[PDB]
Design a binder for this molecule. Structure first.
Ligand SMILES: *Cc1cc2c(cc1C)nc1c(=O)[nH]c(=O)nc-1n2C[C@H](O)[C@H](O)[C@H](O)COP(=O)(O)OP(=O)(O)OC[C@H]1O[C@@H](n2cnc3c(N)ncnc32)[C@H](O)[C@@H]1O
Ligand SMILES: *Cc1cc2c(cc1C)nc1c(=O)[nH]c(=O)nc-1n2C[C@H](O)[C@H](O)[C@H](O)COP(=O)(O)OP(=O)(O)OC[C@H]1O[C@@H](n2cnc3c(N)ncnc32)[C@H](O)[C@@H]1O
Ligand SMILES: O=C(/[C]=[C]/C1=[C][C]=C2O=[C]OC2=[C]1)C1=[C][C]=[C]C(C(F)(F)F)=[C]1
Ligand SMILES: O=C(/[C]=[C]/C1=[C][C]=C2O=[C]OC2=[C]1)C1=[C][C]=[C]C(C(F)(F)F)=[C]1
Ligand SMILES: CCCCCCCCCCCC[N+](C)(C)CCCS(=O)(=O)O
Ligand SMILES: CCCCCCCCCCCC[N+](C)(C)CCCS(=O)(=O)O
Lengths: 500, 495
């Protein structure tokens, strides 16, 4: 066997952050990575037509201070996603340009319903502890409904229900009927709430890394040298003896004091355990699927949309639209003009049947209509990745919880199993599902092992992160009217009382 | 490498039934079984205290002609589950004895509501094709709601909603909010409907095998001999070369022309595939959990409940009861007297933390209350099995589909992947979830390979089964009033 202190299973950002912390603390680490590359759900493609493109995780923003600190220490820099010109909301076959993070509503009744929808998502979120969502006072009631059921109760207008549906589909690459309401409300609150999660400027989609996010995992592999073993899918973990034994598919055995599992929870099923996992984890890892998304980047000669005072952001409602959301993906130098779009949830399954050329044609026709621009029919290059086909991801962006699962099984997501500790973005408490959460979880799992070894005290396991000096976070604020305007049923109760 | 015609992954009833059919046709088969035993979600324990006890699947009944025929060929006999005396429905802390399969209602409004609930489950089932539930005319609408949401819509009384809840929990060992309404309605319809699935006499729980259901898998292993490889968990399947390569955790390599996957769909995740699975199967096998149950058998000196004209069936409402449903587990001679109970769904998760002795005390005190007998407090033995803990099952009885999954991914369950064909009870079209479905699916997957080999024509892949002579089915009937009484909102529209 190859002997070390800690085997890290998985060389995504989470495993690589865990391994780096352990290596920096003076332990002997090995990373066992299934693929011929590091980065996992991040993947930066390089070729002469695109220079570089993120086909996986890409965006970082204010309050994501751990990924910003890690990337900065590795010599990386960010740039701002283009949001100079107008956003577009495309609904019922027409485009409505706007500014500010939320598409505006003019109809007074529709305005109360929209305002109440976002307000109520955050009001419910404030009842949910980030580190223990199952402790919310109505956890059971909220976990036993889908997001579809919650929207049917909350939204008194079709306008608000349709926009809320797109919000769920885009945030968690799943249908409203697929996901627990408790879990979704937790997921949004642990990113800092509705405004922070949806925003480009001042939110999650503010920035990208110059040269691609895959550099985070690659530059850590460079620091670790031959400690990263590529094409070593882990098949077996045996904790019955004094040291843990970890076996790979390519017939190698690693011996360690502790293991960090840094893979999506359900991909733990690809490992045979001796002794068997405890009942709750054994069943949990069959109950937690990942979402479905194709990330598609269409290249153009020039960022022509900016000449029409459009930034490239399109929020597109409607079953026929393949893509519900786009961002400008033009390089910071202004060249390699491109539109990034997501094909979400059922559409990632429905349109996976088409050829690459057929998907490009449908996307160009959609963009031509939404942008009112024949130039959108003149692409120069196309790249795409359907994350649903990845054996060693299971989907993207992250793991969702169907109704009933988070209250029954969520307590064991990051509960150690003897000498196995659990990393991966799914186990984070702040920007779980993101590159930020991957760093939080990898460093927390590593510190749990440092504590087990008597190297640090228990109060150093969870560590706060200083605010980025490069990416300052503007606070989330509301107006008096946003806070106190009635809901639709609130207004009807007021009318009822006046008339009585 | 060990060379054969077909490798069957899994030595449950489905894999054993598939391997027996291929063997009988003259092919060289190997069965690779992860555990140190065969039988999978069937497990018969033998000891002097119980003689034998089914800790997994046990019951068979009319219309399950394939498991009855296979068991009869292997030399097995059935006996009837005791239903001579009265059933009990325990409601709001009191026992109400009854006869007939459905617990009766006396309040006129509650009566209409209960009648409508069962009738409506079967009306909806008649629009769901057994072999393609995703082709139901309302497939998306019904797949996008949980059973909890359907029961909220349908049930005007708490009485009906709570008994419907017990029905779901008992049939599919899952909460109403965990499961798709389309999938659950399919599940009931593909067992022959509400009457057939809930009934002991003339239904799914009519009979047990003399000596235990484990003998089905054990006696096929006896026939196959050293073709069955125990403690061979499959870790890797490679389809890139002329022959399929199957690798096990204990470092053995098998080469075959074809493979049958006879494991629960989600346990496909324990295998690394080269080339990778197609996208839809890759995601499907992450979306299909199994239910949660503890099967508990309390032994007594005598079947003392029979003296009070109770058969031992208990239907026990409410959150506090650990067990919602029991059957008499006494042997056909009246000895090894016992009550079988299930701890279902969230209760299996909640009560798993207790000791075996703590569960025994809770069950005995519940049974004393429900049977109104102090005799229930004097057990002579106890056996139990928590199926949630099994690495190579994932739970029991079967796989459930959460909302949205059956319409998006259902078509992929039995779609071959190059030279891998899919067996397992989850792929059956009649009593999927049962030992009957295990036999149907194993034999169908085996005949798909015989067709691939040019040995049989396409029309022989799916084969009908003659009715058992020993366990004939009687018709399910309804009354004029059951068919035509209004629903509660129906009685209101007339007002
Ligand atoms: C895919 C995707 C993700 C994504 C996104 C868009 C798409 C299309 N948008 C994001 C964004 O703009 N900003 C952001 O912060 N996140 C975004 N996401 C999510 C993000 O990519 C993920 O949250 C993050 O990358 C997850 O990191 P983590 O380290 O937790 O997980 P991983 O990347 O999946 O890495 C796991 C590794 O383990 C290997 N593996 C899997 N099984 C095994 C076995 N058995 N043995 C050994 N290694 C294994 C995987 O190959 C992977 O490298
Ligand atoms: C558990 C249970 C099941 C059950 C029930 C009560 C309980 C507590 N009551 C039933 C009843 O009264 N009547 C009835 O007809 N069914 C009842 N059920 C369900 C029934 O037991 C199942 O439907 C049936 O046994 C399923 O058979 P099938 O052959 O489809 O599946 P299996 O038994 O799970 O067998 C799978 C085998 O595969 C092995 N395995 C798993 N992974 C691997 C790997 N990687 N490699 C090799 N082998 C593998 C398993 O160990 C198993 O033997
Ligand atoms: O929810 C939104 C974006 C979420 C988002 C967008 C990209 C992501 O990449 C990984 O996680 C991601 C989350 C959103 C953006 C603009 C407008 C709206 C609104 F308001 F619903 F229209 C929602
Ligand atoms: O649904 C019922 C039984 C199902 C059943 C009982 C045992 C089983 O073992 C494997 O599948 C099984 C299914 C049932 C039986 C009597 C009454 C009721 C009722 F009516 F809901 F209470 C339900
Ligand atoms: C009069 C009925 C209008 C239904 C409106 N919706 C939004 C559908 C339901 C409100 C639910 S709740 O009534 O607020 O609980
Ligand atoms: C009263 N419940 C049964 C709650 C709703 C009736 C369902 S509906 O009004 O027919 O949708």
């Amino acid at each position: 066997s190859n002997k070390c202190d800690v085997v890290v299973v998985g060389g995504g950002i989470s495993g690589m952050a865990a391994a780096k912390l352990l290596h920096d603390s003076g332990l002997n680490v090995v990373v066992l990575e299934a693929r011929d590359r590091v980065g996992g759900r991040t993947y930066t493609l390089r070729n002469q037509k695109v220079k570089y493109v993120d086909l996986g995780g890409s965006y970082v923003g204010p309050t994501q201070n751990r990924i910003l600190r890690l990337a900065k220490e590795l010599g990386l820099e960010t740039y701002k996603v283009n949001e100079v010109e107008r956003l577009i909301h495309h609904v019922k076959g027409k485009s409505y340009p706007f500014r500010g993070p939320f598409p505006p509503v003019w109809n007074p009744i529709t305005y109360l319903d929209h305002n109440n929808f976002w307000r109520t998502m955050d009001d419910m979120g404030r009842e949910i502890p980030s580190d223990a969502p199952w402790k919310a006072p109505l956890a059971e009631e909220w976990d036993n409904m889908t997001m579809k059921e919650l929207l049917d109760k909350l939204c008194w207008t079709e306008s608000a229900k349709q926009l809320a549906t797109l919000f769920v589909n885009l945030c968690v690459t799943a249908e409203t009927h697929e996901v627990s309401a408790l879990w979704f409300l937790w997921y949004v609150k642990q990113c800092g709430g509705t405004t922070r999660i949806i925003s480009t400027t001042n939110g999650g989609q503010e920035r990208k890394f110059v040269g691609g996010s895959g550099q985070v995992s690659e530059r850590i592999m460079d620091l670790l040298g031959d400690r990263v073993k590529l094409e070593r899918p882990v098949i077996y973990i045996d904790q019955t003896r004094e040291n843990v034994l970890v076996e790979t598919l390519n017939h190698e055995m690693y011996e360690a004091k502790y293991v960090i599992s840094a893979i999506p929870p359900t991909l733990g099923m690809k490992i045979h355990f001796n002794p068997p996992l405890p009942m709750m984890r054994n069943q949990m890892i069959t109950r937690v699927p990942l979402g479905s998304v194709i990330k598609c980047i269409v290249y153009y000669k020039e960022p022509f949309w900016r000449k029409k005072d459009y930034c490239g952001t399109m929020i597109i409602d409607g079953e026929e639209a393949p893509v519900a959301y786009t961002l400008d993906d033009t390089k910071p130098e202004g060249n390699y003009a491109a539109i990034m779009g997501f094909i979400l949830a059922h559409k990632a399954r429905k349109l996976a049947r088409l050829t690459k050329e057929e998907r490009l044609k449908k996307l160009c026709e959609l963009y031509a209509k939404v942008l009112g621009s024949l130039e959108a029919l003149e692409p120069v290059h196309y790249e795409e990745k359907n994350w649903c086909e990845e054996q060693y991801s299971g989907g993207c962006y992250t793991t969702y919880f169907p109704p009933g699962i988070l209250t029954q099984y969520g307590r064991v997501l990051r509960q150690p199993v003897d000498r196995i500790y659990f990393a991966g973005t799914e186990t984070a408490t702040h920007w779980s599902g993101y590159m930020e959460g991957a760093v939080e979880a990898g460093e927390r799992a590593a510190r749990e092992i440092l504590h087990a070894m008597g190297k640090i005290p228990e109060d150093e396991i969870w560590q706060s992160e200083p605010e980025s000096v490069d990416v300052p976070a503007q606070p989330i604020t509301t107006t008096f009217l946003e806070r106190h305007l009635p809901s639709v049923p609130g207004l009807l109760r007021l009318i009822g009382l006046t008339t009585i």
